[PDB]
Design a protein around this ligand. Structure first.
Ligand code: SF4
Ligand code: SF4
Ligand code: SF4
Ligand code: FES
Ligand code: FES
Lengths: 239, 241, 59, 688, 164
């Protein structure tokens, strides 16, 4: 379960009903058939989670009933198993979203660093809360648990669905202030590419920190692995 | 959704076949251990606690970092060097979770002296876990932090078994009431009893991982919880009269 | 009992026992001990006082 | 064997159990009944309710006794303080989100959650937060859902996957928001879909036709048998006075395990409509109410004024053995011989009981590794028997079918569809014969649609040749089985209820009767009841047979009498009266004894015991109730004896071997009057 | 060691049933009905001796023949007689004196005890042995580990692997 999906049962919509059609393109069908070959033929059902992910980029950022039924027919499994998998996992959107899916981490290591102020900045700028889409159909705001980027807290991940399967981008933006996330949102809206990763350092190397969620404060100190890398070496395996 | 053990994955695992699940960091250090020798690897750290370890230091720290270090290093050494120390000095420290989120927190008195080690955090009523270090300072509402941890464990429950599925939401509701002080003093002992009812009674270890932070919060900051309850009546009993 | 609700520590209904004694055949009833604990003077007579209330178990 | 029974210790008592048994089974063998919510004997083990937690020595945690295997020398404790604390804690977790619904819930009074809370739980709660609320689901006309009462035991999901075979339920969502059902609006389409209401331990899934009508403590329960098909499932009828309120299955591992089809469970509401409660005689105004003396006199006058060759008696699908032997003896005492059965093949030879019964029996069929079905649809003939066939499929028994292809909820190999395919299988043209020839215990099941055919003798000869070549019947194993779909057919074959040679000849040249006795018959053919004949109908529902009759004599239904019925494996079972007789109706054999007195030739029996003794005098196995003999097998001597019936009426190799049941929900007069069965058909019609 | 319900008053009930002189009391057939003083046509009715099966709605086994030595489970039942509706209110009327006496009051530990009661009272009886439960599970899903075995779809073929 995620935001934007308050139902664990199907609700009919003119956009989302049993009459709606889904079909793969040629290249997406090639991708899906390449995914299936990673697994034994009598355990072909192992491929459901990557195939459903690929179907989610193909359909435009969300899974419809027709897409799930097509995936069920493709993997030769009952549709209720597919509905179980699609409702179980957090990334699978089952209602229509915007072009870019903005997901903010809210767990305690990001919360100490001031993720609440980043949420406040996003809501003041875009004009929407968590679980909502803008009136232009551009941004969808969501909340996530810990994203495994806690040393660069506080962070936002943004998913790109404007290019389909071939140009799918899931980009982490880290070490943020309100100004950084406002600039990233403006850069995306204007058509540019904001810089990935941390906004004040390269990686998880020792440098400063965001103090109070509003200002980066650089700090100098001991850094490891600053010299030349180690040479190849092996001991004598005989005796 | 996890299976019950027995059977064990090395007996019946993936597709009914023998299977071993191992961590990335466990797998990656093996070629260096085989090339450089087991005696080289066991020369670091205490007995039964051998080798080196990646440590992630996050939270109220001047220089948050993923850094490799020898095991059995003290917390104060591991934080003051390699990470620039606690934001505002070491005397501004309030609490530290030493092993991710599933292990109980430690206060300032235990942290000054304890070694970051398997057989040293366990005797301090905690655990090394994944060696992920989260630091809070004296501006932190520690009840609010553990309440967000309770929200995480409610959100991440798979719902298969009765105690985890029903009681993580109950723990979250009780913690949310405790944050505002809208509770009774004996509800703290009730909260400890509910964590003891979840822990050890579930299919997998997420129930224990949901009970353990609340146990550490109660054990090391029961006075803070009692003061939060008592001082809330300075803004709730002025309307009753 | 508002917040301490555990029942098996106060399950008086289901915790009583009946035990079959060993077969009362070759026991030793000594009447000397029975009549040796009885008084013979007016003072040294001891009386069992009447119970004031039946057990309430604190409630 | 290397000590195939291992010894464990339950509360310091030594217990011997079979190998592979769990801790819960060891506790059950010690006389301790461990509380449980998700474990079931017939389902796979889940281990998710955490109620079965016991203590094992040298284990610091409580173990789940349903899933934990029992090792040698294991020490189990079921009454320590940690076991009781575990039980109270798990019950408290089960009750925090449950709705305060016991007054409006139908399980109240027979609820596992209520009783287990009373015994193994506490008396208080400390929970004052808001509860979880769930919307209800639509699963058809037989299953009612109030899903706020679900406790996530997943018994329904395991049942639908493993026994029903449809696999349409699942758990959607995660955590506290896990939710049982179908993601889209669907209808539960299994014939065995009322059993999941029994399997649900709470009032999340209740019976929609039964809803809000009774509490369980008010019901007088009677153990009877089911007559809606030929298996004879063992049931319990619950009544409040004169009215039957519900029907439930009861355990019989040799017949039906614990299941019952939806027709046998829900057709009881047809007993409240169109009932015959008074005798009627047709006058110039029409049928009008008459006394029993007048109705018996009119029937006797019509039976005596006609010649003996102009009288025919037809037995219905639900006639017990006592009424059938009474009608047979009464018609034979008048010099008549025209006896017919509503279930067809009335001229079938009934000389050896092994030729029209299941020699393997129902429980003995589980020892077969390969099963060949010939011309049968077991899913519509007996869904409980088909469930046992699916159970055999799940642990390795392979199934092949010669007949029309049907949905059976398990995979089978379609050998063919006509008797030409059967002959090709017997010769060796199909590779399934080599699969049968190498099988250790092969089995052949022949359905009733084969016996209804005009060329049934040639087909049975081909089946006998196939069984002889494939080793189906040998020393130590008899794998030849013939099943039926009607309750009264095997008893009529057992007693000799069949037409004489003169009556068969008179039907061959086209003689037509003038007096017809309809013993509960409403699905007779038009060749057997001519227009302008005198019709005596004896039955319990007003239907096609009563609208045409001149004399109506009201009898008892199977919920009102104790009659004998024999299933297709040869087992003699009996109904029992759960309610008294309705109105001015009588016992069914008693009407025929009174009518034999009014005619002028009394039957020689005056009591229920005496007519049962007459039945035991005809065939002695009738006296052994709830048991089955081992029938004699005469090899190919019987087939050699009836070769004249094979030469006459030759084989039709192009007509497909099909099943005659085209309406599963409405097969007799009771199920045709049931409004629940009509809603069941309407639900399958409105989905297209 | 011996411990078969050894913590309740039922120990003091099993003995007092085997007191000498009183454990061997016996009467001839139909003799107890002559001295009972109830009308003699009551003993022309038929009785059933049986142990009722477990209800399908619940899973507990306490009211079955599994706990036969602990609890009396055998019953005596009679056939129904006529019932009709009251014209004024609609209540169910009856003329049966044995309408609830066998189902409420008469319970026995064994089948032979109920037979002995019927024989000395003069009731003709039929005995119905209950159907025995089976404890052995199916070959599939015999243990919890067979849910995840190789019997689901066979051993996986390693022919879709890279390098085949
Ligand atoms: S403890 Fe929680 S996550 Fe683990 S099996 Fe039980 S419900 Fe699922
Ligand atoms: S299932 Fe129904 S009867 Fe049972 S406890 Fe819940 S509300 Fe009460
Ligand atoms: S509906 Fe009944 S059987 Fe199904 S999971 Fe819920 S409680 Fe269990
Ligand atoms: S807490 Fe935000 S990335 Fe882990
Ligand atoms: S009965 Fe064993 S966990 Fe449910």
């Amino acid at each position: 379960t995620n935001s934007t999906d308050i139902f664990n049962i199907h609700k009919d919509t003119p956009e989302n009903n049993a009459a709606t059609s889904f079909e793969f393109s040629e290249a997406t069908l090639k991708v899906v058939n390449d995914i299936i070959a990673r697994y034994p033929p009598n355990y072909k059902q192992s491929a459901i989670i990557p195939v459903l992910d690929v179907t989610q980029q193909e359909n435009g950022g969300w899974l419809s009933l027709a897409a799930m039924n097509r995936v069920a027919k493709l993997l030769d499994m009952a549709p209720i198993r597919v509905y179980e998998v699609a409702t179980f996992y957090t990334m699978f959107n089952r209602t229509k979203i915007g072009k870019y899916h903005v997901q903010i981490c809210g767990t305690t290591p990001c919360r100490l660093q001031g993720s609440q102020k980043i949420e406040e900045a996003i809501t003041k700028h875009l004009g929407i809360g968590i679980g909502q889409t803008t009136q232009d159909g551009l941004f969808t705001l969501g909340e996530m648990e810990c994203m495994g980027a806690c040393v660069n807290a506080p962070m936002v991940a943004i998913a790109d669905y404007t290019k389909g399967v071939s140009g799918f981008e899931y980009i982490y933006y880290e070490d943020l202030t309100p100004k950084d996330i406002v600039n990233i949102l403006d850069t995306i809206k204007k058509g540019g590419k904001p810089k990935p990763g941390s906004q004040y350092r390269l990686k998880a190397e020792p440098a400063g920190a965001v103090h109070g969620g509003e200002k980066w404060v650089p700090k100098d100190g001991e850094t490891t692995l600053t010299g030349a890398p180690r040479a190849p070496y092996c001991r004598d395996l005989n005796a | 959704k996890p299976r019950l053990k027995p059977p064990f994955p090395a007996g019946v695992g993936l597709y009914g076949c023998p299977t071993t699940v191992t961590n990335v960091e466990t797998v990656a250090v093996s070629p260096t251990i085989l090339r450089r020798g087991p005696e080289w690897f066991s020369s670091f750290g205490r007995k039964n606690n051998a080798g080196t370890k990646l440590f992630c230091i996050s939270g109220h720290v001047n220089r948050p970092v993923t850094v490799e270090e020898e095991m059995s290093i003290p917390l104060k050494e591991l934080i003051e060097r390699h990470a620039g120390g606690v934001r505002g000095g070491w005397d501004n420290l309030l609490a530290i979770i030493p092993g991710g989120s599933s292990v109980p927190l430690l206060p300032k008195k235990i942290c000054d002296g304890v070694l970051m080690d398997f057989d040293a955090l366990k005797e301090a009523q905690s655990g090394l876990g994944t060696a992920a270090v989260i630091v809070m300072d004296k501006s932190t509402d520690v009840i609010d932090a553990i309440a967000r941890l309770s929200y995480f464990y409610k959100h991440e429950s798979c719902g298969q078994c009765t105690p985890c599925r029903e009681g993580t939401g109950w723990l979250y509701d009780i913690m949310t009431r405790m944050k505002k002080g809208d509770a009774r003093l004996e509800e703290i002992d009730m909260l400890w009893e509910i964590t003891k009812q979840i822990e050890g009674h579930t299919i997998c270890a997420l129930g224990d991982a949901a009970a353990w932070p609340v146990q550490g919060l109660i054990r090391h900051f029961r006075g803070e919880m009692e003061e939060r309850i008592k001082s809330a009546g300075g803004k709730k009993k002025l309307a009753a009269t | 009992l508002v917040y301490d609700i555990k029942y098996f520590v106060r399950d008086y209904r289901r915790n009583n026992k009946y035990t079959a004694r060993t077969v009362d055949a070759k026991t030793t009833f000594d009447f000397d001990k029975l009549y040796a604990g009885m008084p013979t003077k007016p003072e040294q007579v001891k009386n069992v006082t009447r119970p004031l209330i039946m057990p309430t178990r604190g409630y | 064997p290397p000590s195939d029974h291992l010894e464990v210790f339950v509360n310091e008592q030594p217990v011997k159990i079979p190998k592979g048994s769990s801790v819960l089974q060891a506790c059950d063998a010690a006389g301790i009944d461990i509380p449980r919510f998700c474990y079931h004997q017939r389902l796979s083990i889940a281990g998710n309710c955490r109620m079965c937690l016991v203590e094992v020595e040298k284990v610091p945690k409580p173990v789940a006794s349903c899933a934990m295997p029992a090792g040698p020398g294991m020490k189990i404790k079921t009454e320590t303080p940690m076991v009781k604390k575990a039980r109270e804690g798990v019950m408290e977790f089960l009750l925090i989100n449950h709705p305060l619904d016991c007054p409006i819930c139908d399980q109240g009074g027979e609820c596992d959650l209520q009783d287990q809370a009373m015994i193994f739980g506490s008396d208080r709660s400390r929970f004052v937060e808001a509860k979880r609320a769930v919307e209800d689901k639509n699963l058809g006309p037989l299953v009612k859902t109030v899903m706020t009462r679900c406790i996530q035991c997943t018994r329904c999901v395991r049942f639908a996957s493993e026994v029903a075979g449809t696999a349409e339920l699942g758990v959607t969502g995660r955590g506290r928001d896990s939710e049982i059902g179908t993601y889209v609006e669907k209808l539960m389409g299994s014939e065995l879909s009322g059993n999941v209401v029994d399997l649900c331990p709470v009032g999340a899934l209740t019976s929609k036709p039964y809803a809000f009508t009774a509490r369980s403590w008010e019901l007088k329960g009677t153990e009877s048998i089911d007559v809606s098909d030929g298996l004879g499932a063992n049931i319990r009828v619950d009544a409040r006075g004169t009215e039957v309120m519900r029907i439930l299955p009861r355990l019989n591992e040799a017949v039906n395990e614990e299941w019952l089809s939806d027709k046998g469970r829900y057709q009881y509401d047809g007993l409240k409509h169109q009932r015959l409660d008074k005798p009627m005689v047709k006058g110039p105004k029409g049928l009008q109410v008459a006394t029993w003396q007048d109705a018996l006199g009119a029937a006797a006058a019509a039976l005596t004024s006609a010649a003996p060759g102009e009288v025919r008696g037809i037995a219905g699908k639900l006639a017990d053995a006592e009424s059938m032997v009474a009608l047979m003896d009464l018609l034979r005492g008048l010099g008549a011989g025209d006896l017919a059965h509503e279930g067809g093949f009335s001229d079938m030879p009934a000389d050896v009981r092994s030729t029209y019964t299941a020699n393997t029996t129902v429980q003995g069929l589980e020892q077969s590794d390969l099963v060949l079905l010939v011309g049968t649809n077991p899913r519509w003939e007996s869904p409980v028997f088909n469930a046992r066939l699916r159970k055999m499929f799940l642990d390795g028994t392979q199934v092949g079918l010669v007949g029309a292809p049907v949905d059976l909820t398990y995979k089978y190999e379609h050998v063919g569809s006509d008797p030409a395919a059967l002959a090709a299988l017997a010769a060796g043209q199909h590779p399934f014969l080599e699969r049968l020839k190498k099988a250790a215990r092969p089995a052949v099941v022949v359905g009733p649609g084969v016996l209804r055919r005009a060329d049934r003798e040639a087909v049975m000869k081909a089946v006998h040749e196939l069984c002889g070549k494939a080793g189906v019947v040998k020393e130590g194993w008899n794998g030849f089985n013939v099943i039926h779909d009607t309750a009264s057919r095997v008893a009529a074959l057992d007693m000799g209820f069949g037409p004489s040679a003169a009556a068969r000849a008179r039907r061959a040249q086209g003689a037509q009767p003038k007096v017809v006795y309809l013993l509960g018959s409403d699905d007779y053919s038009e060749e057997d009841v001519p227009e302008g004949a005198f019709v005596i109908y004896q039955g319990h529902h007003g239907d096609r047979g009563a609208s045409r009759a001149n004399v109506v004599l009201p009898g008892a239904a199977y919920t009102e009498k104790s009659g004998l019925y024999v299933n297709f494996e040869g087992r003699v079972q009996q109904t029992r009266a759960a309610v008294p007789l309705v109105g001015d109706a009588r016992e069914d054999w008693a009407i025929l004894r009174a009518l034999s007195e009014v005619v002028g030739k009394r039957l020689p029996y005056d009591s229920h015991a005496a007519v049962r003794a007459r039945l035991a005098g005809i065939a002695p196995h009738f006296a052994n109730i709830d048991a089955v003999q081992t029938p004699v097998w005469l090899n190919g001597e019987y087939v050699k004896g009836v070769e004249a019936l094979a030469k006459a009426a030759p084989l039709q190799p192009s007509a497909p071997l099909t099943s005659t049941i085209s309406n599963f929900y409405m097969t007799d007069a009771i199920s045709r009057a049931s409004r629940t069965m009509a809603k069941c058909i309407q639900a399958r019609q409105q989905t297209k | 060691e011996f411990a078969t319900a050894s913590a309740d008053y039922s120990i003091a009930m099993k003995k007092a049933a085997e007191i000498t002189g009183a454990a061997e009391s016996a009467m001839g057939p139909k003799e107890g009905g002559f001295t009972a003083g109830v009308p003699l046509d009551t003993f022309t009715r038929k009785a059933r001796i049986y142990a009722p099966a477990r209800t399908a709605s619940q899973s507990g086994l306490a009211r079955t023949v599994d706990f036969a030595t602990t609890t009396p489970a055998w019953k005596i039942e009679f056939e129904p007689t006529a019932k009709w509706q009251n014209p004024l209110m609609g209540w169910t009327s009856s003329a049966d004196p044995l309408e609830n006496v066998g189902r409420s009051a008469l319970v026995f530990y064994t089948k032979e005890e109920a037979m002995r009661f019927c024989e000395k009272l003069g009731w003709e009886y039929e005995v119905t042995e209950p159907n025995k439960r089976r404890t052995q599970r199916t070959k599939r899903y015999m243990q919890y580990g067979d849910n995840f075995g190789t019997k689901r779809a066979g051993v996986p073929d390693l022919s879709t692997l890279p390098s085949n």
